[PDB]
Amino acid sequence: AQYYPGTSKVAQNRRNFCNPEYELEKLREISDEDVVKILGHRAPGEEYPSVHPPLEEMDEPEDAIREMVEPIDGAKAGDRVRYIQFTDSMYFAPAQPYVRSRAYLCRYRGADAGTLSGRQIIETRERDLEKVSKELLETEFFDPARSGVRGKSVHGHSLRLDEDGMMFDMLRRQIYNKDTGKVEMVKNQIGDELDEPVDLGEPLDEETLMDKTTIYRVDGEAYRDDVEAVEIMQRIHVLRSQGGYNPE
Amino acid sequence: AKFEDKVDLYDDRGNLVEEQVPLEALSPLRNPAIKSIVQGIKRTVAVNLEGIENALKTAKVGGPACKIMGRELDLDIVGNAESIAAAAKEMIQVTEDDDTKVELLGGGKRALVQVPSARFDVAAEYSAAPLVTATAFVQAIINEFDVSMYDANMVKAAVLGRYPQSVEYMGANIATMLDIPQKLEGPGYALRNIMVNHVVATTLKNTLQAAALSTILEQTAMFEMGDAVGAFERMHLLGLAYQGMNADNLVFDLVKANGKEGTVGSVIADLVERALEDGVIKVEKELTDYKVYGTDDLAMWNAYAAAGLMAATMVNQGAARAAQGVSSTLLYYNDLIEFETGLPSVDFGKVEGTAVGFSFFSHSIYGGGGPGIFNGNHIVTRHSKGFAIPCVAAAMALDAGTQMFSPEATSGLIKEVFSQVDEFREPLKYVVEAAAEIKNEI
Amino acid sequence: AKFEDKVDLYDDRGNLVEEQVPLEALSPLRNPAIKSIVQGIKRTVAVNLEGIENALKTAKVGGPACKIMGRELDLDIVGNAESIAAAAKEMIQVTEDDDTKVELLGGGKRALVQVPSARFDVAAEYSAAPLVTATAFVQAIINEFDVSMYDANMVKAAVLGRYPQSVEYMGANIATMLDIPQKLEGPGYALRNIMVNHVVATTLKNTLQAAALSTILEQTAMFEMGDAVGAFERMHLLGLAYQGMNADNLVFDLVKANGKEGTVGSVIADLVERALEDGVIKVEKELTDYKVYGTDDLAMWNAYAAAGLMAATMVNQGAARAAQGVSSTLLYYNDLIEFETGLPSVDFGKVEGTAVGFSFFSHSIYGGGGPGIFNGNHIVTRHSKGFAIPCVAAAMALDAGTQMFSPEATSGLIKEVFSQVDEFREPLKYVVEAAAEIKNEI
Amino acid sequence: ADKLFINALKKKFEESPEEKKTTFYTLGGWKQSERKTEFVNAGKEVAEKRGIPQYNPDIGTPLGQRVLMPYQVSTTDTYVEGDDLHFVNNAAMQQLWDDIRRTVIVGLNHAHAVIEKRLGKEVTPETITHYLETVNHAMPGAAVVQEHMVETHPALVADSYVKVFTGNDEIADEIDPAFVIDINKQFPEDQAETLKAEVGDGIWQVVRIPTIVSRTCDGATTSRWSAMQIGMSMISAYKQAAGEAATGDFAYAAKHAEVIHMGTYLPVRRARGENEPGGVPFGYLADICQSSRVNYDDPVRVSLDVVATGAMLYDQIWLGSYMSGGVGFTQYATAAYTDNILDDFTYFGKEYVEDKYGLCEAPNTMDTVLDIATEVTFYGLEQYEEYPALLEDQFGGSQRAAVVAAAAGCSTAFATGNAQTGLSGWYLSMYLHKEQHSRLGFYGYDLQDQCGASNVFSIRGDEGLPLELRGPNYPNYAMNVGHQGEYAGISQAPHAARGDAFVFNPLVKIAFADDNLVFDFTNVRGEFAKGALREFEPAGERALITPA
Numbered sequence A: 001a002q003y004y005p006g007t008s009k010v011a012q013n014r015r016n017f018c019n020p021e022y023e024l025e026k027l028r029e030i031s032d033e034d035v036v037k038i039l040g041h042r043a044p045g046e047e048y049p050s051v052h053p054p055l056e057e058m059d060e061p062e063d064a065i066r067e068m069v070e071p072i073d074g075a076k077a078g079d080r081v082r083y084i085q086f087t088d089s090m091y092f093a094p095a096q097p098y099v100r101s102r103a104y105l106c107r108y109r110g111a112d113a114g115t116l117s118g119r120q121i122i123e124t125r126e127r128d129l130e131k132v133s134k135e136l137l138e139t140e141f142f143d144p145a146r147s148g149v150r151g152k153s154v155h156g157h158s159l160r161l162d163e164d165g166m167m168f169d170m171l172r173r174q175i176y177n178k179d180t181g182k183v184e185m186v187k188n189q190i191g192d193e194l195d196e197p198v199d200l201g202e203p204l205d206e207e208t209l210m211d212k213t214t215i216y217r218v219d220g221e222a223y224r225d226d227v228e229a230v231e232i233m234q235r236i237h238v239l240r241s242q243g244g245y246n247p248e
Numbered sequence B, C: 001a002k003f004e005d006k007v008d009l010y011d012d013r014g015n016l017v018e019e020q021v022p023l024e025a026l027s028p029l030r031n032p033a034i035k036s037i038v039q040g041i042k043r044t045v046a047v048n049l050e051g052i053e054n055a056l057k058t059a060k061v062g063g064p065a066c067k068i069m070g071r072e073l074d075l076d077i078v079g080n081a082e083s084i085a086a087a088a089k090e091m092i093q094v095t096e097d098d099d100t101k102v103e104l105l106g107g108g109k110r111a112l113v114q115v116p117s118a119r120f121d122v123a124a125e126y127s128a129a130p131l132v133t134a135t136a137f138v139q140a141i142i143n144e145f146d147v148s149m150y151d152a153n154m155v156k157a158a159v160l161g162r163y164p165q166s167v168e169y170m171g172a173n174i175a176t177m178l179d180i181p182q183k184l185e186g187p188g189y190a191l192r193n194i195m196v197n198h199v200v201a202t203t204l205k206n207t208l209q210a211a212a213l214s215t216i217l218e219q220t221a222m223f224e225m226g227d228a229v230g231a232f233e234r235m236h237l238l239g240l241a242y243q244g245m246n247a248d249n250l251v252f253d254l255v256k257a258n259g260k261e262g263t264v265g266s267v268i269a270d271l272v273e274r275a276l277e278d279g280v281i282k283v284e285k286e287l288t289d290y291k292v293y294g295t296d297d298l299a300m301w302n303a304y305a306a307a308g309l310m311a312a313t314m315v316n317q318g319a320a321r322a323a324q325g326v327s328s329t330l331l332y333y334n335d336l337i338e339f340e341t342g343l344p345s346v347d348f349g350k351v352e353g354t355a356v357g358f359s360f361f362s363h364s365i366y367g368g369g370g371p372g373i374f375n376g377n378h379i380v381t382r383h384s385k386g387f388a389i390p391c392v393a394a395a396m397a398l399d400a401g402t403q404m405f406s407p408e409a410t411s412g413l414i415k416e417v418f419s420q421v422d423e424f425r426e427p428l429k430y431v432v433e434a435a436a437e438i439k440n441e442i
Numbered sequence D: 001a002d003k004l005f006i007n008a009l010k011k012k013f014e015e016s017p018e019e020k021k022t023t024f025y026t027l028g029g030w031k032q033s034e035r036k037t038e039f040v041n042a043g044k045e046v047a048e049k050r051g052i053p054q055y056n057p058d059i060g061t062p063l064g065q066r067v068l069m070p071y072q073v074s075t076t077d078t079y080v081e082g083d084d085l086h087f088v089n090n091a092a093m094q095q096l097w098d099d100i101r102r103t104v105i106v107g108l109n110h111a112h113a114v115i116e117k118r119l120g121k122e123v124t125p126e127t128i129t130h131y132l133e134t135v136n137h138a139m140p141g142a143a144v145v146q147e148h149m150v151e152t153h154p155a156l157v158a159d160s161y162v163k164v165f166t167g168n169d170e171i172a173d174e175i176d177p178a179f180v181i182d183i184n185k186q187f188p189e190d191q192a193e194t195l196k197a198e199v200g201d202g203i204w205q206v207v208r209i210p211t212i213v214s215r216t217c218d219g220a221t222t223s224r225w226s227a228m229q230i231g232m233s234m235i236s237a238y239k240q241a242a243g244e245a246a247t248g249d250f251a252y253a254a255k256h257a258e259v260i261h262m263g264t265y266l267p268v269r270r271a272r273g274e275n276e277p278g279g280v281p282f283g284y285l286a287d288i289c290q291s292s293r294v295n296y297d298d299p300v301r302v303s304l305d306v307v308a309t310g311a312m313l314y315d316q317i318w319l320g321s322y323m324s325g326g327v328g329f330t331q332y333a334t335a336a337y338t339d340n341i342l343d344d345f346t347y348f349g350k351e352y353v354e355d356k357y358g359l360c361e362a363p364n365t366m367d368t369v370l371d372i373a374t375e376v377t378f379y380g381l382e383q384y385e386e387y388p389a390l391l392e393d394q395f396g397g398s399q400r401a402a403v404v405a406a407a408a409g410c411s412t413a414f415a416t417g418n419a420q421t422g423l424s425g426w427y428l429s430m431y432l433h434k435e436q437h438s439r440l441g442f443y444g445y446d447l448q449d450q451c452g453a454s455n456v457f458s459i460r461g462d463e464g465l466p467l468e469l470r471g472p473n474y475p476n477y478a479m480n481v482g483h484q485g486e487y488a489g490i491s492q493a494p495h496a497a498r499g500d501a502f503v504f505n506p507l508v509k510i511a512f513a514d515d516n517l518v519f520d521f522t523n524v525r526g527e528f529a530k531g532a533l534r535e536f537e538p539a540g541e542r543a544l545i546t547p548a
């Protein structure tokens, strides 16, 4: 699969995020317990809640499609469908909203992805969400200054940065410590205080952000200069126009 | 034949049934099983005799939370259902042993009614089905118990609700798959105003049958709307065949290859490879490390893409056994496939657009709801001309119980009655056999 | 036979055609000419090619007083009407030599279209007729002149108007007798939303034929509405027969006897005498110098009274050659006949009630208009179940030119196209002949 | 010269507009804001008086962790907090809608034919003047025939009246001028002659019913109220029986045969009668706006005054209340009429067009669309990139999508002189924007834009329509913010560039060229500023009949 046209670094990074064969760079270690804390759907050690019985106990009808499509493990167990949501700064966060949704439906099974300008969300079965979330938090999908885990009050993608390079957060879930150079997650994604904060590590430096980003900007790589990517967008516009008029 | 295309037809287990069937043998305009299904759905009514009885004995008539104290009537309708049904049938029929049916279900608690076809030959539309059924049952109930003139208006209220003060049959204890003509978003829309949950309930959550029934209703509406006339006809026929009838086993084989470990993206890759193998698309030119694909047959590319879209929904929402992500699949299958190929997505962007709105209106405060309450007449999901809603039906068929407004919640009366009808419940074999029957008339 | 009643049927000159025809041979459910008329009206469309051409050349599209400067397109549509019509026909038909018609009128300025029956077999309602016709002509016009992609949307606007921003086809240059399904006052009403002036124009102002077409449409709607089911069926059949089909020559003979010098009152006197002579009514008892009449057959008394009502309209509005008084005739025929007899008036007071409102709303500031703009779907005139509007049709047929909103003003396009169809124009002849033909199978 | 939004950005923020960093969290929360402070105190007073808690800043999340911005109303020097541009808080905005809702256009052409051809009486300018004196007594709710009638208080209904217009200059001048919309005085020469030729010898009434009635009732009241009092005035002025058969012809004419509603009725899911915002097509909205007849040497100003009119009506009142409600959609709309931002982008596009093609001289083709819409989209997005303060100002992606695409679409239409290629440019802008920033609008923003390209030139039943005829009930457009008012602008754009007197209905254009309206439709943005400042005096108030 080729995923996306273009010859910029931005275009290559977009392809890399989409490509399940591309092994995402691990930038930080976050324990399974701290993923569960950040998510805020259940307490550590709490058995998974259930929205319905395990598939073995709710007797699905005979169906070739069901027989051919393997349920994800959380579906087998009847897990709730829960979410994780990120906001990405337009100041060179590595991932960006359509990049995430496109990538999620190439890389992850059983995924409900939604794109908005100031928030991007995935909803899936709870135990699977936990595994996906570990990857979303530990790898270059995430930077703790230019990205934020936010289930509400998402304002910030388009705001100026603060003096530490941190994106705005109305609820200040992620706190930069000048004395350590690290970001601490002090609240879960919905904004409730953690009894024990989670170390998110150091923010990426500015040159590395520019190297890894998937946003086009005049002060980075501009979309208008990635002429092959622009060509394909214009082509799609024209062919959609033609098809709607007369597809013969 | 107007079109030279031929398709191979399969059953819902992926077995070859008929080879090289002319495309037009699947047309709603030609295929006698589609005709039978559509006429059947027009003329079938579910009657809730238990509901009528309970409404009368409590005087709870005329809509939610309504009651008229002092108007209670205690009538043993369910206990006398055989006589009432036979009396109603005598009024509903045109002639003895015509195609009228009145059949009791659930020990007399429900009745399946099929109003005779002859009444619709001389009708403008389809409302004769509920209106003839309603008055026949009102009259039969009055006559069964010698209900007085002074009290009979309560029987009327219990059967048909607040109509005509309300435009709809508000609080009625009869139900149809179709809704009243005034609620159409546009002329020609009536076969689109059928709730996804009704289709899923009727087909007993069999995924391919739900997709087939939904596609039959949607694409048949496209003919009534005039959308499948002239330049657009072949596009709609190929959509019907490849997206809803598993033509060439393409949907089935994509699901087979991607069901164990696959994603929306992996289904896309397989579909593009298949389109290239079959000569539907080819490389038009090369950019830097990027192949630009073209086609001389937009309608066939669209149909292949539509088959992949259905398979992608089955793989993604099937893996979750949760329907909500169908709005996401309908969006990003199409978004991804455009940037993968340089070709337009299904319905030239209209499925992606529908999906954007549908995603919004199934995850926000402003309206909509769960996938099951949508339909082709819904303002959110009317925009694609038949290529989106059948995927929603497939996704809801695959849902293992994540929805509050499930078919069990919204569609129990419809399920009980309409799933009795073989051609409604399992339409694909009937449409395939009918295609075989007329193949030499095309 | 369900009913034992038999009627003698006559031609529109009052000559006997067939004796002792069973009542049900005139039923909309049984009579093949009524079926042909209803199906015909469902599928027929008037296309104003001159109107499309003028709208395009002036860019006057989208409704009254609307224009888009700079969008003008000068296309010789009328000059190329044969080619355009033939291209449209190819798209409208289902198969070659099916029952599709596309026929030019007025030197190519107009076209009569009949959309093939097969499209309605798999449709829920009737909107396929204008929608299939519209897109076929839009596509035919584009192809005739190689209209660019950039300009084609103007052709669409010229044909179908502001739809879908408007719910109706606002500013369209096609027309049907039927109106869109959303405008129905109730489900089942579509055959009632046909302007009186359209009926009068189509039947070329022949009084008996106008009355017959109106009665056919009204009483057929009563079946679709469920009103003519069970206990009420005979009443509606007798109404159709005696009020609109001149059964037993009763309307004709009442007019003959009262035409030279008669009044509404003298028609009443003759009808009451005839009902007594025929055994339909009898003296029940005597008050002081006043005979109280009774009947054991309300449906037949009603039908006799309805025949007299039609004759009274013909005598009163025929004498004035002015339609406006039909609202008065419909009121006082019924008011007078009750106090003459002690029996209920036509439709048990509902014609009188309809007439009160119709009088008001044709002589006041508040709404309505002249008699010709009413119809059975109009809020003013929907209340009687078929027994009022046919008299309005007869009255407008008899109007010699007293109306501003005449059929010439409101219905010229419909007239030109629909009057071409023999069964629309002279329905009394066809329905009587069909009844005679099936008399031995009832 | 400076970009047109630079002054506003300098007024809003401490930092220069190019600076990428600022300060948060230490601004005092809501206490930074005069308006929020007013609201906190009012909420306490409300709760105390009624015994139920109401506005309370401590509910939910805490506003004002960032700067709560003032907005410049574009083309003005007025800066206000956004709350002052909420339609609930802005009497000018409410009166804009009331003045549309309470207006109907009613012909006298059928009516005069009934008088001459059926009643057999003459119609002259003198009989017309007598009729107009009569109907200006009757229309606000006063009697002319019956004894013992009870009537509306004239001071409560002072905003209701009837005027006429005609293309026949000699007839127009023979009618008492108090009752005439003078086309020659209100329109520049070229526009006046266009409009008079459209109307010809036709004579048309512009009827405005009382605001107090329109507020008590609905839009569908207007043509009925109009027709009743037209009917009474015809009876009184032409001396016929007060209720004879001919009376019904006047009713049908006034209610149906020669009425022009501002809006057509809506389908059941969004059920509404006539003269509601969803029924008003984009070309009528452009013609209601009167910028065209005063700013006719500046097509950008004309087009963006239409955008302001439509963004407010369609997003704030229609989508933000009729179709939803609550806090609503103030800033989805203000993005299109504040801080001179859309103005900067659109003047850029107009200059690009004038330099490359000449106004209205470009081929009406997809090549022109690709050129102009791409260039203008890239300019607009570059401004958000160059000026972090601009991006923080128009913080929602939807706002930016609408503003950039409006400039792109208007500019394309300036070049082609055709609104349909303008529309294609709007959709291309969205697609480019989405790929440039890997985001566009809110969850459901681009339903119509994804469907958009394919439906621009479609001819199918519920797809194909010239843009001027489209409106909020066009199926793809029926749900979402950040499009409808901008489409009204694109509808206006080619006609402004061509110098056309109207976009879609010349009667609608003439009907709002009336200095007796309450809202000033020649300067919509000026009026929004006046209302924001609490300086606008609306009609329809009840002070006269309530305690002092």
Ligand SMILES: C[C@@H](OP(=O)(O)O)[C@H](NC(=O)CCCCCCS)C(=O)O
Binding pocket: B361, B366, B367, B368, B369, B379, B380, D269, D270, D319, D320, D323, D324, D444, D478, D479, D480, D481
């Ligand atoms: C979708 C539909 O809602 P329902 O699904 O019918 O509840 C419709 N609302 C809307 O379209 C809301 C539009 C305004 C709010 C969202 C703006 S982006 C309506 O209420 O008729």
Ligand SMILES: C[C@@H](OP(=O)(O)O)[C@H](NC(=O)CCCCCCS)C(=O)O
Binding pocket: C361, C366, C367, C368, C369, C379, C380, D224, D255
């Ligand atoms: C009849 C109908 O008018 P039209 O014939 O459709 O113009 C209808 N008016 C009315 O019913 C007026 C009722 C109020 C005035 C009379 C009170 S007795 C209406 O405007 O929809």
Ligand SMILES: O=S(=O)(O)CCS
Binding pocket: A116, B360, B363, B364, B365, D442, D443, D444
């Ligand atoms: O977040 S949503 O896109 O659902 C609503 C934006 S107001």
Ligand SMILES: [Ca+2]
Binding pocket: B436
């Ligand atoms: Ca066989």
Ligand SMILES: [Ca+2]
Binding pocket: C266, C269, C270
């Ligand atoms: Ca006599």
Ligand SMILES: [Ca+2]
Binding pocket: D009, D010, D011, D012, D013, D014, D015
């Ligand atoms: Ca400053």
Ligand SMILES: [Ca+2]
Binding pocket: D056, D057, D058, D059, D060, D061, D062, D063
């Ligand atoms: Ca708060």
Ligand SMILES: [Ca+2]
Binding pocket: D169, D172, D173, D184
């Ligand atoms: Ca003058």
Ligand SMILES: [Ca+2]
Binding pocket: D184, D189, D192, D193
């Ligand atoms: Ca002049």
Ligand SMILES: [K+]
Binding pocket: A048, A049, A050, A052, A053, A054, A077, A078, A079
């Ligand atoms: K479980």
Ligand SMILES: [K+]
Binding pocket: C005, C006, C007, C008
């Ligand atoms: K007889």
Ligand SMILES: [K+]
Binding pocket: D167, D168, D169, D196
């Ligand atoms: K002149």
